[PDB]
């Protein structure tokens, strides 16, 4: 029944790595929940096999109000084990862009979609800015475990720092804890031990280092996960290993926010920036 | 205290001594009531003529109005169609009040629906309310057409009807072929009759505007009859009978008698009879079109003259002898059908009635009020009977109607002491009948209080009320009476002469005082 959340900079493979983690978790007899708070409703593309899942708020507005919304109309199980829900987001410049998460999660508890068959519930939240609905899962203690997606790019580290500050601010409110760091790999030198060092100074552990592989694009054309596409692919075994360390991860610590200058010092000492 | 054998209604239970004592104690203790002599003095002051002068100086206060808002007439006109529902795009209170009013008057079920908007539509419009109301009404009550009227608030907010209806029909809410005529019915303009006219014109424009290519006047050899705002089923019945006895093809339009009167046999019919849609679609093929009530049918007059190319005759409402004869003349000249002998016999019966009752009808003074054409018909009939109409009030009469009634009064020597009022209310009538006492008033139930006031001044100053018009609440099934035509003149004469004789009998009943005139034969 543990609740987890992917936090991180956009475009760092949050949706793809999350979805492959779901595909890995599905096969060993686990029923798992997936919801993405990303304003673009691409967090459930690979599992559901739909062109674009109709998000909660679109069909809530078309149906007049969220009261006239049915759970079955949004709770779609593309695969047998896993169901898929999309929170959605408003039009740009129309109110706060995170209230879709508010409505989605509130409706989810209202209809009790968290009952008697959940092993993991996993959210994909935009971590570029933590505010309003994006900062909400930290706030009401809905997501016990948070995992941060990062790369060697400096904005990924800064976003991870902002996540650390956010969880530190709301540590006393509940059991919201950082379960570890997962880092996707771009074709750049000296990356894995970097994120290992960020975890070391953060007081947290490094979960797994997922590389850049060709099979991912083929899966994108296919619109099925790598494990569903190519279970013998080395990347599929990599995702399976990542999933088994998520399940077998035990330590959940209160992070330590890191200033700008020390981050910059690590960045120059590794030479990622001059 | 209540005896089981003589169970007593509130009157006269509250006349018991203990109840009188408790009421006296309450009044003397906590009501702070003004002294009784002061109350009588103020009553006498209100009776006087200077109070009449103060009353006639009114421009911002209306006391006891004698008119209703347009959507009432809109609903009455809409109810005249077959398998049709009135839909008032406004607040539910309007529809509730219309339904209660018509239930009280006709004592028959009345169907009407609304979208029942709230602050939400007050700030953001009621297009969604239109959509849900239309689709819910169609899915639930299964009508063949929905006639859309509007309340005051929908007109103030500037809510347009055509655009919302088109959007509803476009977004799949209702079938695109479903007839949904509409009309703007602001409540701050005119009265209920104007609302009836607006609804009728809206329906006629919806049905007979886009298909005028193949319409030829006089093709079907038929006459169109528009009755207007009518609350007398007997008027519809006499119109139908008189036209049927004359062998003329007739097309009554917006006729509600079948739905306003249904037999009780164990089942309830929401829909009953009415003018079919084909009849309205075939209306322009008629030879002509007559209007029963011209003075509140001006917009539809313009429509029928400028679109259906019908030479509408200059006919007055068929009340009395002369105007009924003129109506028969016009119908005969249009249709080419001679007047049957039965109509002549009925007219001769009318002349016999007037000869028989002239000895009592002459010289009597009447103050009457109601709708403009009803009022003018009653005035004409009274003038043909040797009566003397003294106070004529029409709350919803314009200057041209006043000029016409002045002209008709100047045509008879019995209209010398007659004065016509427009824009006045029933308080002005109370002042007029107090200062210049007539013999009777002719009006709806709302005047019954005025009589009460007169009874306080004295029996010699009390003037009785005869109930003719709309609405009538304290009498049962009087809506069944007939007013137009020879039969209607018959009924009006009978009622008037019987009321006169009843008043005389009541006055001359004092024992050893006034019973010397209590004649057996009158």
């Amino acid at each position: 029944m543990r609740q987890c959340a992917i936090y991180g900079k956009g475009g760092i493979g949050k949706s793809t790595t999350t979805q492959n983690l779901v595909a890995a978790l599905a096969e060993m007899g686990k029923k798992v929940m997936i919801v993405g708070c990303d304003p673009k409703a691409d967090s459930t593309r690979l599992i559901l096999h739909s062109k674009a899942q109709n998000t909660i708020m679109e069909m809530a507005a078309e149906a007049g109000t969220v009261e006239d919304l049915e759970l079955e109309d949004v709770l779609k199980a593309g695969y047998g084990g896993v169901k898929c829900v999309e929170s959605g987001g408003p039009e740009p410049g129309v109110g706060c862009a995170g209230r879709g998460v508010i409505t989605a999660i509130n409706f989810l508890e209202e209809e009790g979609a968290y009952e008697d068959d959940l092993d993991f519930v996993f959210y994909d939240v935009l971590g570029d800015v933590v505010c309003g609905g994006f900062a909400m899962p930290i706030r009401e203690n809905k997501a016990q475990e948070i995992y941060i997606v990062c790369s060697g790019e400096m904005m990924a580290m800064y976003a991870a720092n902002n996540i650390s500050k956010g969880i530190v601010k709301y540590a006393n409110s509940g059991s919201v804890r950082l379960g570890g760091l997962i880092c996707n790999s771009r074709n750049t030198d000296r990356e894995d031990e970097l994120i290992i060092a960020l975890a070391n100074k953060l007081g947290t552990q490094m979960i797994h280092f997922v590389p850049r592989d060709n099979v991912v694009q083929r899966a994108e054309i296919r619109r099925m996960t790598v494990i569903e596409y190519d279970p013998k692919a080395k990347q599929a075994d990599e995702y399976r290993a990542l999933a088994r360390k998520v399940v077998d991860n035990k330590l959940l610590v209160i992070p330590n926010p890191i200033t700008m200058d020390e981050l910059e010092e690590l960045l120059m000492e590794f030479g990622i920036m001059e | 205290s209540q005896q089981v054998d003589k169970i007593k209604a509130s009157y006269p239970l509250f006349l018991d001594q203990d109840y009188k004592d408790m009421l006296a104690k309450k009044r003397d203790g906590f009501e702070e009531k003004y002294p009784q002599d002061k109350i009588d003095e103020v009553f006498q002051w209100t009776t006087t003529k200077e109070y009449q002068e103060l009353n006639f100086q009114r421009e911002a206060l209306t006391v006891n109005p004698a008119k209703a808002c347009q959507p009432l007439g809109a609903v009455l006109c809409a109810l005249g169609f077959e398998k049709t529902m009135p839909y008032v795009h406004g607040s539910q209170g309007c529809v509730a009040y219309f339904r209660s009013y018509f239930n009280r008057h006709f004592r028959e079920p009345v169907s009407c629906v609304s979208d029942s908007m709230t602050e939400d539509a007050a700030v953001f419009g009621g297009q969604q309310n239109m959509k849900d109301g239309l689709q819910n009404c169609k899915a639930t009550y299964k009508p063949d057409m929905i006639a859309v009227s509007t309340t005051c608030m929908a007109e103030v907010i500037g809510d347009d009807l055509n655009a919302f209806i088109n959007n509803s029909k476009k977004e799949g809410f209702i079938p695109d072929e479903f007839p949904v005529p509409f009309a703007h019915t602001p409540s701050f303009v005119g009265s209920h009759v104007t609302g009836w006219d607006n609804m009728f014109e809206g329906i006629a424009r919806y049905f007979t505007l886009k298909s005028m290519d193949d319409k030829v006047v006089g093709s079907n050899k038929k006459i169109n009859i528009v009755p207007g705002f009518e609350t007398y089923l007997g008027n519809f019945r006499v119109i139908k009978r008189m036209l049927s006895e004359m062998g003329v093809g007739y097309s009554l339009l917006s006729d509600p008698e079948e739905v306003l009167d249904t037999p009780a046999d164990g089942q309830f019919r929401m829909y009953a009879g009415g003018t079919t849609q084909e009849e309205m679609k075939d209306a322009p093929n008629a030879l002509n079109t007559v209007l029963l009530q011209p003075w509140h049918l001006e917009k539809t007059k313009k429509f029928v003259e400028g679109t259906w190319k019908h030479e509408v005759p200059k006919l007055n409402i068929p009340m009395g002898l002369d105007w009924t004869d003129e109506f028969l003349m016009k119908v005969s000249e249009i249709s080419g059908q001679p007047i049957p002998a039965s109509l002549t016999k009925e007219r001769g019966r009318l002349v016999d009635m007037m000869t028989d009752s002239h000895t009592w009808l002459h010289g009597k003074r009447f103050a009457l009020w109601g709708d403009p054409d009803f009022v003018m018909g009653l005035v004409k009939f009274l003038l043909e009977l040797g009566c003397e109409p003294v106070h004529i009030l029409c709350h919803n009469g314009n200057k041209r109607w006043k000029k016409a009634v002045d002209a008709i009064l100047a045509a008879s020597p019995y209209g010398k002491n007659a004065t016509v009022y427009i824009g006045k209310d029933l308080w002005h009538l109370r002042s007029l009948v107090f200062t210049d006492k007539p013999d009777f008033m002719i009006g709806n139930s709302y005047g019954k209080f005025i009589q009460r006031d007169t009874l306080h001044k004295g029996k010699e100053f009390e003037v009785p009320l005869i109930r003719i018009g709309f609405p009538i609440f304290d009498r049962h099934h009087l809506h069944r009476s007939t007013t137009l035509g020879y039969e209607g003149a018959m009924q009006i004469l009978t009622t008037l002469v019987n009321s006169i004789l009843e008043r005389l009998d009541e006055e001359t009943r004092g024992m050893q005082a006034t019973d010397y005139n209590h004649d057996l034969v009158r």
Binding site: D68 | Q2, V4, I7, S10, Y19, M22, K25, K26, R27, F30, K33, Y34, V42, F43, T46, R58, E59, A60, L61, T62, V63, N64, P65, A68, C69, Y87, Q92, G93, C94, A96, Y97, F98, R99, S100, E108, P109, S111, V113, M117, E119, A122, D132, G133, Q135, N136, A139, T140, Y141, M153, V156, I157, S187, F188, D265, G266, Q267, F268, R430, F449
Partner: protein, 477 residues
Amino acid sequence: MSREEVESLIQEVLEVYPEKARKDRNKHLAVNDPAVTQSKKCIISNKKSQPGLMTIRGCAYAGSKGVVWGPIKDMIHISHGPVGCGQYSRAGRRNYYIGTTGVNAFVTMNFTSDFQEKDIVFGGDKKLAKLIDEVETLFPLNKGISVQSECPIGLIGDDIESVSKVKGAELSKTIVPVRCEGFRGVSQSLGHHIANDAVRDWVLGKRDEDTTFASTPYDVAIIGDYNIGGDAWSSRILLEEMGLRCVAQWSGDGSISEIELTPKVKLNLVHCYRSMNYISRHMEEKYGIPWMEYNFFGPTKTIESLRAIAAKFDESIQKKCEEVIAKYKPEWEAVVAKYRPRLEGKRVMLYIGGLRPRHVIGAYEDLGMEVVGTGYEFAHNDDYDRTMKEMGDSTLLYDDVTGYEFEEFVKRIKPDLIGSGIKEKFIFQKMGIPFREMHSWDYSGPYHGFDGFAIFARDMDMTLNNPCWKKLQAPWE
């Protein structure tokens, strides 16, 4: 009985509605379970009516002017706006009173501002001021003026508060501006609340200095009794026979002086909790005046309320209450003995506005009838919690029932008597089912106390066992 049949009935009734209307209406029909204390898990109340469903609810103007402010006799009420609103509400409600019309009482007369197109375009403040002046000149005797706003007043944005204050200061008269636009609220409940708030914010505050009144340890104020057909007078004589002193009556035969003197009352007896709970709560909070609910419908409820009422005073009041009970026992015993055998075992469904469905079950049950279905147009959840206990198991409960709905339930249930308003009396009378107007007592009454209980039993025997009900079908059909 046959609870399963009831919910299958409501399922088979709700199918015709579209998905939105069906889903919304499914929350407003229920099967009564007397063990339920919080009705919020069984029935949903106080919601907007679905558009185009032939609803029965009124407007806030009806709930304020036609219900609360109207019965007061010594004040003049002005319908600010078009002509229809007051005209359809003129003397349509039988709030009885004592006085002279047009001189010192103005209940059954219509005062309206007579709005026209220019009034809408430019405004009605100056017209309202001139109207107030003309009211003062034509009617010197009246003690005060109330101005009931209608839909156009709120929609065009006139300042009736400012003109009320200015004219009241100028003429030294109490002017109560009340904002009861029909679109405000979903039913008459908001009209009741608005009238209560206006009463609180003007009349109650008008005099706080006065103490010239001589009080007594036995001052009781009637709250929420509108003297419909004389109900409040029967309740008042029953109270005074018990030894108390009734100072204020709200609002049937109600006077502005009684309204102002009400805060000097030892105990408040609220009859209609819904219409006047707000003022009772405000009084209890400010003046510390205890208030409680009493029922005067039927002998059993009357006796229970009288005993509970006497329980709040010394033993002399209790002795007088016992004396009154003993005095009035034989009358209602004889009424019951005469009418119960003709009335035993009959089933009745009810549909009235607020607190009347729950108030009169006792009178029905005393005569041997049982209630199989009931509901409200605008009652909130608290009234439902109050009324769930008073109804038997497996009975029907409905809120804001529609014409099609109510017709289908009456067709399936087939009761012997139905009590509801004028808007359903003739749609049900053509189905061969006896019907009683539960709002105006069908131009009869009163129904309160033992004297009104006699009227109630007589009228119900009269309507139910009538020969006309046996001749609806032709002999050759």
